[PDB]
């Protein structure tokens with residue numbers, strides 16, 4: 363797990379996200395979609411978005427970004443005690459949305475990129491280490507649920 367110090371770093375970084383949840387959410391999804399276009403195909407509501415301009419101009423994409431990061435923030439603030447919060451997410455993503463764990467790796471990487479991009483020089487080595495651990499933990503706990511379900 364993460365140490366108390368590490369959790370404190372994670373939630374300190376998360377302060378940045380909470381000052382502009384929609385802006386961070388939007389940039390994360392744009393980073394995901396642009397770098398990994400196959401991921402767009404998992405969203406019937408975003409498949410029409412043929413350019414990054416269209417993405418940036420989509421109010422509904424920003425709205426979804428807010429839903430996404432609010433859910434992740436809820437999870438993070440549990441500091442690893444997130445079984446109740448994580449289980450239904452794991453299950454909807456495997457069973458309904460059919461999201462391979464690879465795409466969760468992609469979005470983890472996107473969050474790290476976006477934090478650097480929006481806060482250059484203000485996302486230190488220790489912070490990146492802590493946030494990365496927290497995201498791997500999220501990812502790994504989801505992967506356990508995927509295995510249970512036999513979802514690939």
Ligand code: MNR
Pocket residue numbers: 401402404405406407429430431433434450451454455459461465466469
């Ligand atoms: C590559 C694609 C996917 C990735 C990566 C991804 C990563 C993440 C993620 C990681 C930080 C969090 C937190 C996250 C959280 C959500 N997510 Mn998710 N998600 N996610 C979807 C694709 C993806 N998610 C799709 C598709 C829906 C349904 C969208 C619609 O309303 O049409 C959805 C829906 C949701 C919903 C709405 C409730 C539900 O359906 O369970 C939440 C909350």
